[PDB]
Each structure stands twice: as structure tokens, then as C-alpha cells.
Amino acid sequence: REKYYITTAIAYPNGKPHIGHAYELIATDAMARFQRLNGMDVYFLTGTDEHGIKMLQSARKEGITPRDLADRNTSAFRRMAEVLNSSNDDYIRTSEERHYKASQAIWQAMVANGDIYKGGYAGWYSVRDEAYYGEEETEVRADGVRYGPQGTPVEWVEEESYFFRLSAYQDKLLDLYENNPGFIMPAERRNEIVSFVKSGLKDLSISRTTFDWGIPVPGDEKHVMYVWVDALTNYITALGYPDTTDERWAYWPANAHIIGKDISRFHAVYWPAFLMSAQLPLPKRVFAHGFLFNRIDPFELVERYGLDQLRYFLMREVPFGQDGSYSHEAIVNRTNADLANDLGNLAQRSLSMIAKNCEGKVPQPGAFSEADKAILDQADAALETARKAMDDQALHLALGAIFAVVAEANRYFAGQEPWALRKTDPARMGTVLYVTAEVLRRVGIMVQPFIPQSAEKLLDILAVPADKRQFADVLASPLAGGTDLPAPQPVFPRY
Numbered sequence: 394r395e396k397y398y399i400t401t402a403i404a405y406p407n408g409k410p411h412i413g414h415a416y417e418l419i420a421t422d423a424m425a426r427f428q429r430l431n432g433m434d435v436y437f438l439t440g441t442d443e444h445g446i447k448m449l450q451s452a453r454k455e456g457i458t459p460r461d462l463a464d465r466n467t468s469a470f471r472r473m474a475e476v477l478n479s480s481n482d483d484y485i486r487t488s489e490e491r492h493y494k495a496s497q498a499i500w501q502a503m504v505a506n507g508d509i510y511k512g513g514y515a516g517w518y519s520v521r522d523e524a525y526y527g528e529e530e531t532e533v534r535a536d537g538v539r540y541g542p543q544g545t546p547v548e549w550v551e552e553e554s555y556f557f558r559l560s561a562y563q564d565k566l567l568d569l570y571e572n573n574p575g576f577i578m579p580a581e582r583r584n585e586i587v588s589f590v591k592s593g594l595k596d597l598s599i600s601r602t603t604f605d606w607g608i609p610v611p612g613d614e615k616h617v618m619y620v621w622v623d624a625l626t627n628y629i630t631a632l633g634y635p636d637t638t639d640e641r642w643a644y645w646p647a648n649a650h651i652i653g654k655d656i657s658r659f660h661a662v663y664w665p666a667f668l669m670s671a672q673l674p675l676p677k678r679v680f681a682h683g684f685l686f687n688r689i690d691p692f693e694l695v696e697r698y699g700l701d702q703l704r705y706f707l708m709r710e711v712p713f714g715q716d717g718s719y720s721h722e723a724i725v726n727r728t729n730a731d732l733a734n735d736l737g738n739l740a741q742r743s744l745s746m747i748a749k750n751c752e753g754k755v756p757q758p759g760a761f762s763e764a765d766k767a768i769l770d771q772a773d774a775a776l777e778t779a780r781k782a783m784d785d786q787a788l789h790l791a792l793g794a795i796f797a798v799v800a801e802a803n804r805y806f807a808g809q810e811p812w813a814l815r816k817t818d819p820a821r822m823g824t825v826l827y828v829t830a831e832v833l834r835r836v837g838i839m840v841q842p843f844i845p846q847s848a849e850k851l852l853d854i855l856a857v858p859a860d861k862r863q864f865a866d867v868l869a870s871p872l873a874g875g876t877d878l879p880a881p882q883p884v885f886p887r888y
């Protein structure tokens with residue numbers, strides 16, 4: 394019943410999908426699936442940012458229109474979403490008419506608030522540095538040329554441009570950060586943002602006259618919208634903006650925008666200012682993840698390691714928010730240890746013993762020992778730890794909690810030696826096997842968002858009905874003695 398709206402930043406399709414795009418989508422997919430399983434009404438968006446001079450230039454090099462090039466390149470990004478088992482509810486492309494309409498509506502809403510004017514984007518510019526400088530940072534030298542602070546020439550350049558009055562939003566933004574401490578996370582991103590805004594905000598250039606591959610400025614179509622208004626507006630286009638009677642519009646404001654660290658300023662300064670101007674509520678959180686370093690191509694990685702192995706590796710190994718590294722060795726070893734051995738072989742050993750010794754039926758549990766209770770209770774408590782962690786986008790901590798249950802369940806199983814009980818105390822063997830399977834059911838439910846296909850197969854070999862797989866079922870729906878289980882197969886083979 395409670396609504397939950399989560400988004401990824403939109404990708405720029407002037408190339409192939411890379412591991413950065415996949416990482417962001419995987420992480421956001423896991424967060425979306427988690428909230429569905431937690432009983433929320435979820436809407437999950439991703440998409441592509443298709444306008445701009447770079448897309449126009451690539452299109453000319455290839456002898457096709459920009460719209461045609463966008464159609465062609467975005468299709469690989471859509472393929473990436475499919476191959477990664479993304480549950481996104483919609484896919485937004487800034488070339489779509491609905492986006493053109495939404496961007497022109499938010500532009501006009503900011504004009505009506507008094508926040509947009511026509512002027513001159515003008516300053517000392519260094520072609521070699523690709524940077525603008527204040528006059529005070531420059532000096533005319535012996536040759537008569539003016540130089541900027543990096544010792545390269547600068548020259549005055551000037552273009553007509555519309556501006557957003559960002560300077561009017563300094564205090565409102567500082568108020569926002571003070572009243573919503575979680576508005577921009579992790580903490581280091583917040584400190585960078587607050588210091589930036591405290592240093593003083595200048596009005597923001599929001600149009601270009603140099604190319605026509607973009608959305609025309611209403612009332613002045615020699616200008617097109619620059620990236621700021623065009624790309625950021627996607628998040629409301631997908632909910633039917635400007636039509637506030639659309640059923641989807643109740644999802645606004647977003648619960649979380651998931652982004653890379655390089656675009657933090659744009660989501661935590663520019664976007665909220667635009668929203669305030671346009672009389673719209675603000676997202677509850679912007680969370681910036683880090684970057685990954687090989688130390689290549691997501692399709693190749695999925696083929697080589699398996700989808701769920703990659704998904705798990707990326708979310709478990711790198712604390713979400715930090716930079717990290719992947720390598721062949723790290724992926725193989727981590728996924729062999731946690732998935733093929735710990736989880737996968739726990740299921741294979743226990744469930745084959747049920748097949749062989751308990752007639753393929755869940756055994757009827759007797760009294761639980763202290764050890765039995767401890768592992769059962771540990772599994773329950775991991776659900777709560779996972780929920781709290783996911784409220785803070787701490788994916789690694791959710792997975793860590795869940796896989797600590799798996800590690801402990803292996804210790805439990807080995808310590809009980811149920812093979813030895815087969816002779817001496819078959820009923821006790823049955824109870825140990827029941828406990829191991831029931832812990833596996835709870836773990837299976839809890840890992841669905843992170844490794845969906847593999848979790849599903851695990852739950853299928855536990856004969857869990859399709860309508861008993863919500864997080865509420867962890868507590869309410871234990872395995873019933875006497876249930877027929879299918880012959881088990883390894884869920885995670887070793888690499």
C-alpha cells in the first residue's frame with residue numbers, strides 16, 4: 394500500500410554500456426525488489442539521456458540522424474537492463490515526446506515563478522584547459538596574450554543563454570540540508586555539497602544556441618535546453634508530468650535517486666532548486682555510489698561469471714558509496730566461497746540427505762535444542778538488520794547479515810553430524826534436517842532481491858509456493874513437515 398519510487402540516473406548512449414552503468418542498475422534493482430518484497434508499492438525507473446552536441450556529432454560521423462543514432466545505441470542499454478534481470482517498471486528516453494512535453498512544462502513553471510531570464514554566458518575561457526576563469530585569475534603577459542592561472546591562454550567568449558536564478562536558492566538549499574540530514578548521502582557527499590552551497594551560488598546557464606538536437610526553449614526556439622533541465626526532468630516525465638491527475642503522479646516525490654558521485658551537485662543543488670521553483674516537493678534522498686576499477690564489458694562479465702555471481706560480487710565486496718575494485722581472482726574466489734560453497738553446497742548436502750533418507754519429504758521436527766533455536770533466531774534477526782541497512786542504502790551490510798546466517802548454518806550443520814544420527818536417532822536427524830531447510834527457506838526469501846533467479850531456484854527446491862515468498866513469510870510461513878521436495882540440483886556451480 395505504501396508507495397516507494399526509486400530511480401537511476403539516465404545513461405548517455407554515445408557509446409557502449411560499461412560496468413559503471415551495470416553496477417548502478419544492479420544496485421538500484423536490488424533496492425527496488427527489496428521494497429516490493431517488504432510490502433511496498435514500488436515504481437522503479439531507469440533510462441537514457443539522448444540530446445546534445447556529442448550525440449549530434451556521432452550521428453554525422455555515421456551518416457544518420459541523431460534520433461536514429463539514439464534509437465540504435467539506446468537499444469544496447471535496454472539489452473543490458475534485460476541481461477541484468479532489471480525489474481524497472483518503465484524506461485525513459487529523453488527523445489520521447491512525453492519528455493519534450495514535461496521539460497517544456499517545468500521550464501514554463503520556472504518562468505512563471507520569476508526564475509528564468511535571457512542574458513549572456515560570458516567569460517575568460519582557455520581552450521587548452523577547457524575552463525572559464527574570473528578576470529582576477531588572469532594576467533596579460535610579455536607577448537600581449539592574456540593567460541589564466543594554469544599558464545595557458547584565455548580569451549573572452551560570449552554566447553546568448555537563458556539562465557535559472559540559482560543564486561536565489563542558496564538559503565533555501567542550506568535550510569533543506571539542515572532539516573533533512575539524509576537528503577544527500579553518504580556523509581562525505583553531504584559535506585562537499587554544503588560547503589559548495591555555503592561558498593555562494595551563481596545563476597546557471599540552461600540553454601544553448603549552438604545545435605538543434607535538444608528540446609526547444611518555449612518562446613525562443615533558436616535556443617535548446619542544455620543538459621540540466623532536460624536530463625533531470627526525466628524523473629517526473631515518467632510519472633506523467635505535467636498531468637498531476639495521472640495515477641503514477643502519486644509516486645512523486647522520489648524516495649531515492651541513485652547516482653554516481655560525479656553528478657552529486659546536479660541532483661543535490663540544481664534539481665531541488667528547479668523543483669522548488671516549479672512548486673513541487675523534493676526527493677527524500679539522493680544517494681551517490683562510487684566507481685569501480687579493473688585492478689571491461691558487462692555482457693562479457695555476465696557470460697563469464699554468471700549474472701547472480703556478478704550481482705552478488707558487486708553488492709557484497711564494495712561498501713555502497715565507496716570506490717572499489719574487481720578482478721578475475723577476487724570474483725572467482727568470493728563467489729566460489731560464499732555462493733557455490735557456503736550457500737549452494739549447504740542446500741545440496743542437506744536436501745540430498747532429505748531425498749535419500751527422508752523419502753524426499755520435509756521431516757517432521759521434534760523439540761528444538763538450544764543450537765536449533767539460536768540459528769533459527771539468527772535467521773529472523775537478519776531480516777531486521779537487512780531492513781535497517783537497506784533504509785541507508787547499505788547493500789553490503791544487508792548481504793553481510795544474510796551471509797553470516799549461511800556461514801553459521803554451515804557450522805551448525807557440520808556440528809550436528811546428522812549423517813551419524815541416521816543410525817542412532819533418526820527422529821533427531823529429521824529435526825536437524827528440518828532446521829537446516831527452514832533456515833535455507835528464510836535465507837532464500839531474503840536474498841531474492843540480490844540474486845533473483847538463483848533465490849527462486851533455491852525456493853523451488855524447497856517447494857515454497859509462489860505466493861509465500863514475501864518478507865512477511867519469513868516469520869509467518871515455515872516449512873511444513875511431510876511436504877514433498879523435488880530432487881535437488883546445485884544452485885551455484887563452482888567456477
Ligand SMILES: O=C(NCCCNCc1cc(Cl)cc(Cl)c1)Nc1ccsc1
Nearest residue numbers: 402403405444445618619620623624659
Ligand atoms: O550533455 C548531455 N549529457 C552528457 C552526459 C551527462 N551524464 C551525467 C548526468 C546524468 C543525469 Cl540523470 C543528469 C545530469 Cl545533469 C547529468 N545531455 C544534453 C541534453 C540537452 S543538451 C545536452
